[PDB]
Design a protein around this nucleic acid. Structure first.
Ligand SMILES: [Mg+2]
Ligand SMILES: [Mg+2]
Ligand SMILES: [Mg+2]
Ligand SMILES: [Mg+2]
Ligand SMILES: [Mg+2]
Ligand SMILES: [Mg+2]
Ligand SMILES: [Mg+2]
Ligand SMILES: [Mg+2]
Ligand SMILES: [Mg+2]
Ligand SMILES: [Mg+2]
Ligand SMILES: [Mg+2]
Ligand SMILES: [Mg+2]
Ligand SMILES: [Mg+2]
Ligand SMILES: [Mg+2]
Ligand SMILES: [Mg+2]
Ligand SMILES: [Mg+2]
Ligand SMILES: [Mg+2]
Ligand SMILES: [Mg+2]
Ligand SMILES: [Mg+2]
Ligand SMILES: [Mg+2]
Ligand SMILES: [Mg+2]
Ligand SMILES: [Mg+2]
Ligand SMILES: [Mg+2]
Ligand SMILES: [Mg+2]
Ligand SMILES: [Mg+2]
Ligand SMILES: [Mg+2]
Ligand SMILES: [Mg+2]
Ligand SMILES: [Mg+2]
Ligand SMILES: [Mg+2]
Ligand SMILES: [Mg+2]
Ligand SMILES: [Mg+2]
Ligand SMILES: [Mg+2]
Ligand SMILES: [Mg+2]
Ligand SMILES: [Mg+2]
Ligand SMILES: [Mg+2]
Ligand SMILES: [Mg+2]
Ligand SMILES: [Mg+2]
Ligand SMILES: [Mg+2]
Ligand SMILES: [Mg+2]
Ligand SMILES: [Mg+2]
Ligand SMILES: [Mg+2]
Ligand SMILES: [Mg+2]
Ligand SMILES: [Mg+2]
Ligand SMILES: [Mg+2]
Ligand SMILES: [Mg+2]
Ligand SMILES: [Mg+2]
Ligand SMILES: [Mg+2]
Ligand SMILES: [Mg+2]
Ligand SMILES: [Mg+2]
Ligand SMILES: [Mg+2]
Ligand SMILES: [Mg+2]
Ligand SMILES: [Mg+2]
Ligand SMILES: [Mg+2]
Ligand SMILES: [Mg+2]
Ligand SMILES: [Mg+2]
Ligand SMILES: [Mg+2]
Ligand SMILES: [Mg+2]
Ligand SMILES: [Mg+2]
Ligand SMILES: [Mg+2]
Ligand SMILES: [Mg+2]
Ligand SMILES: [Mg+2]
Ligand SMILES: [Mg+2]
Ligand SMILES: [Mg+2]
Ligand SMILES: [Mg+2]
Ligand SMILES: [Mg+2]
Ligand SMILES: [Mg+2]
Ligand SMILES: [Mg+2]
Ligand SMILES: [Mg+2]
Ligand SMILES: [Mg+2]
Ligand SMILES: [Mg+2]
Ligand SMILES: [Mg+2]
Ligand SMILES: [Mg+2]
Ligand SMILES: [Mg+2]
Ligand SMILES: [Mg+2]
Ligand SMILES: [Mg+2]
Ligand SMILES: [Mg+2]
Ligand SMILES: [Mg+2]
Ligand SMILES: [Mg+2]
Ligand SMILES: [Mg+2]
Ligand SMILES: [Mg+2]
Ligand SMILES: [Mg+2]
Ligand SMILES: [Zn+2]
Lengths: 37, 204, 140, 174
RNA sequence: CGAUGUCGGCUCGUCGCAUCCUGGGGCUGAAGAAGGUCCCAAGGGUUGGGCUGUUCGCCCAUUAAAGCGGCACGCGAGCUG
RNA sequence: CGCUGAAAGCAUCUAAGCGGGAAGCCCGCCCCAAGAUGAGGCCUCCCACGGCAGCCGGUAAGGACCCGGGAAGACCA
């Protein structure tokens, strides 16, 4: 999980979701998981 | 929960399987049931045990009325065991078998006014290298202008001992019903001759 | 002419059902009743409002996410002695205290204000033990 | 472009009775109560159940599809029922049925017995396949997720408990 | 400035968390074992020596770890000097 | 980290709902504790005494004083 202030799509499989008041990026590539923070 | 009132009689050691076992000897029973606490009447469950018979010429009328309503001879001590409802009307050492673990509660020995070193195991001060009349003193008790006060619960000199203490999970080494004797492995609070309470341990 | 000052009066016992009412907006009315400011002879320096019985206090209502996020706080005077109890837990453990606390904070500080707070009797569940006072049911 | 508007076929004989805030579905395999938002209206037609929303606001548009699928999942559950299949992989790994309970040997120092909750049945056709079946779709997937979690698929070997159909994706080592 | 005693140590703590350890996690260029990196977490714990006034630091021998800061660079109507 | 799942025909731990999950949080253990003036409860004891929500005096159940002491303690308790 990458925790950063700039969460962005890294590849075209990346999906930006909003989950319980936070921005996450979920993707089939585990390196691309992001949480804003 | 099961319990019994007792007297701490003394310490010795026995030999069990070529091991010396330190024991405290306790004279426990017999304890008459003098009153039962019920949820309907009192809002909780307990049995009020009596212990050590007393000279009736020392028992005043309200106490006598309390005993007589129970059909019990005058006794010196009344104590309750919480959440205990014995079937009989008399609790004896046989509620405990050898091998059971028990909690024991007594009044610890009284140190009276105790210093910081005996009461709280403070380090005190140096005994040479210029130390000036502070060999047993506590040192600093705070900070400066912030917060400009001393915390509640600060450890300081004062009375120490003569207070209720429970020691937990003591092995019952032997039970001698003929003499109402409980043998408990280890140390038990208070002086010989002190009143104690023995209960089934709360440690699983 | 001097302003009218009442001689002492029989207080009025009053009954309020808390179920479904919003915590804060119910409390301000109870506080008004305790101060007796609904009464035309209101006098600020004597205890002369109603006695207020409240039932179903455990059924008080609350907006937003306050059940989880409203924290009651107590300080014991000891290091680390700040206790934080969320509203959820207070309702699960001493529910009558939610309304009591809300009302107490809306009464004046001081001897008269503490006196007025004793005239408020809050109960969880639909029953109260004050039939002998025959409380008058109120809709607020 | 809409699940909420899509009518729900009801096979005879399944009964769909409506009540405020809930929908009760009874069928040949049991009953299910579906909690339903009071803002939504569920309507019974001939061999068909439909759900309608009272506006085009986002919350109503969001509850509309949800309510349709939940009702439909209940209709399927009492008639067809639901099931999920787990493949156990890895040399020593196997399962058996101890009574109606599931015992997994999957590499720990001990077995793992899984007790079935109410409404869940366990089947072990072969030692390396486990079936989880019941009327409640959410529950079937939950129990199945639990059993997969005993020993998840490894990142480096075809070893662990897999969903049937789950693709085996591995990482190299050395 | 008709005085707010000033480094370091000792004693006694208490707090913050940007966490040294222990507990829970995600990612790994994670086979395992051991690491790396970030996230949650302040409940407790966080050794004894040589040098030097030292704080610090280096070194010796260990350790799960030998955390960093605030409290008038905490604490001289408590001691040292 | 999931289940089920729309808005958004797919997808999504979430917008409805459900689960798992820390030495940490609540309780559980130990000790204090009804001046908790919101002053709680139970058992038992004495009794409605004379004379002018008050005063005066003699008593009851009880207590205190005093004395012998105590692994209780500075005195006090
Ligand atoms: Mg891109
Ligand atoms: Mg995806
Ligand atoms: Mg005692
Ligand atoms: Mg002494
Ligand atoms: Mg000392
Ligand atoms: Mg000592
Ligand atoms: Mg000590
Ligand atoms: Mg020392
Ligand atoms: Mg020295
Ligand atoms: Mg010394
Ligand atoms: Mg000197
Ligand atoms: Mg001197
Ligand atoms: Mg000296
Ligand atoms: Mg000192
Ligand atoms: Mg201050
Ligand atoms: Mg004492
Ligand atoms: Mg023996
Ligand atoms: Mg002794
Ligand atoms: Mg009004
Ligand atoms: Mg005024
Ligand atoms: Mg509200
Ligand atoms: Mg309560
Ligand atoms: Mg106020
Ligand atoms: Mg003011
Ligand atoms: Mg039909
Ligand atoms: Mg219509
Ligand atoms: Mg490698
Ligand atoms: Mg100056
Ligand atoms: Mg001066
Ligand atoms: Mg001056
Ligand atoms: Mg001066
Ligand atoms: Mg510090
Ligand atoms: Mg942190
Ligand atoms: Mg750390
Ligand atoms: Mg770890
Ligand atoms: Mg390797
Ligand atoms: Mg590893
Ligand atoms: Mg890691
Ligand atoms: Mg993270
Ligand atoms: Mg992270
Ligand atoms: Mg900590
Ligand atoms: Mg702390
Ligand atoms: Mg620390
Ligand atoms: Mg060192
Ligand atoms: Mg030296
Ligand atoms: Mg030397
Ligand atoms: Mg040195
Ligand atoms: Mg040095
Ligand atoms: Mg240096
Ligand atoms: Mg150098
Ligand atoms: Mg080592
Ligand atoms: Mg380690
Ligand atoms: Mg500092
Ligand atoms: Mg500075
Ligand atoms: Mg400086
Ligand atoms: Mg300083
Ligand atoms: Mg320092
Ligand atoms: Mg200083
Ligand atoms: Mg000095
Ligand atoms: Mg100094
Ligand atoms: Mg000073
Ligand atoms: Mg000074
Ligand atoms: Mg000073
Ligand atoms: Mg000098
Ligand atoms: Mg000198
Ligand atoms: Mg998934
Ligand atoms: Mg899904
Ligand atoms: Mg789309
Ligand atoms: Mg939700
Ligand atoms: Mg849960
Ligand atoms: Mg959960
Ligand atoms: Mg799970
Ligand atoms: Mg532990
Ligand atoms: Mg007590
Ligand atoms: Mg009292
Ligand atoms: Mg008490
Ligand atoms: Mg109070
Ligand atoms: Mg009382
Ligand atoms: Mg007398
Ligand atoms: Mg004496
Ligand atoms: Mg004297
Ligand atoms: Zn991606």
């Amino acid at each position: 999980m990458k925790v950063r202030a700039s969460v962005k799509r890294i590849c075209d499989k990346c999906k930006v979701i909003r989950r319980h008041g936070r921005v996450y990026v979920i993707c089939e590539n585990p390196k691309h998981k992001q949480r804003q923070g | 929960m099961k319990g019994i009132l007792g007297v701490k009689v003394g310490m010795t050691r026995i030999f069990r399987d070529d091991r010396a076992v330190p024991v405290t000897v306790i004279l426990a029973g017999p304890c008459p049931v003098v009153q039962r606490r019920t949820p309907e009447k009192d809002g909780y469950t307990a049995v009020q045990l009596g212990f050590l018979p007393q000279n009736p010429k020392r028992v005043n009328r309200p106490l006598k009325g309390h005993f007589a309503k129970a059909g019990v001879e005058p006794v010196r001590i009344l104590r309750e065991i919480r959440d205990f409802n014995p079937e009989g009307d008399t609790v004896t050492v046989e509620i405990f078998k050898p091998g059971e673990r028990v909690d024991v509660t007594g009044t610890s020995k009284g140190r009276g006014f105790a210093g910081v070193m005996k009461r709280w195991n403070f380090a005190g001060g140096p005994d040479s290298h210029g130390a000036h009349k502070i060999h047993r003193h506590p040192g600093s008790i705070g900070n400066r202008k912030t917060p400009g006060r001393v915390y509640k619960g600060k450890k300081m000199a004062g009375h120490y001992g003569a207070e209720r203490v429970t020691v937990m999970n003591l092995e019952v080494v032997d039970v001698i019903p003929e003499e109402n004797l409980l043998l408990v492995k280890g140390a038990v609070p208070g002086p010989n001759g002190g009143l104690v309470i023995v209960r089934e341990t709360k440690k699983a | 002419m001097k302003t009218y000052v009442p001689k002492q009066v029989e207080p009025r016992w009053v009954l309020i059902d808390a179920e479904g009412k919003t915590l804060g907006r119910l409390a301000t009315k109870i506080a008004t009743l305790l101060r007796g400011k609904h009464r035309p002879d209101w006098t600020p320096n004597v205890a002369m409002g109603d006695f207020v019985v409240v039932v179903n206090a455990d059924k008080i209502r609350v907006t937003g996410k306050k059940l989880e996020q409203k924290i009651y706080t107590r300080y014991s005077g000891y290091p680390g002695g700040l206790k934080k109890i969320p509203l959820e837990k207070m309702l699960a453990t001493h529910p009558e205290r939610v309304l009591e606390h809300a009302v107490k904070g809306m009464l004046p500080k001081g001897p008269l204000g503490r006196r007025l707070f004793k005239r408020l009797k809050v109960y969880a569940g639909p029953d109260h033990p004050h039939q002998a006072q025959r409380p008058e049911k109120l809709e607020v | 472009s809409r699940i909420g508007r899509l009518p729900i076929p009801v096979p005879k004989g399944v009964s769909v009775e409506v009540a405020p805030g809930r929908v009760k579905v009874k069928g040949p395999k049991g009953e299910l109560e579906v909690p339903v938002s009071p803002e939504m209206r569920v309507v019974v037609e001939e061999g068909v159940v439909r759900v309608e929303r009272p506006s085009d606001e986002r919350r109503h548009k969001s509850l509309h599809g949800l309510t349709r699928t939940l009702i439909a999942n209940a209709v399927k559950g009492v008639s067809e029922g639901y099931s999920k299949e787990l493949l156990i992989k890895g040399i020593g790994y196997r399962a058996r049925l101890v009574g109606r309970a599931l015992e997994l040997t999957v590499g720990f120092s001990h077995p793992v017995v899984v007790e079935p909750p109410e409404g869940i049945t366990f089947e072990v056709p072969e030692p390396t396949r486990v079936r989880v079946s019941g009327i409640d779709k959410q529950k079937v997937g939950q129990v199945a997720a639990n059993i997969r979690a005993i020993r998840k698929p490894s990142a480096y070997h075809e070893k662990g408990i897999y969903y049937a159909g789950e693709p085996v994706r591995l990482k190299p080592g050395k």
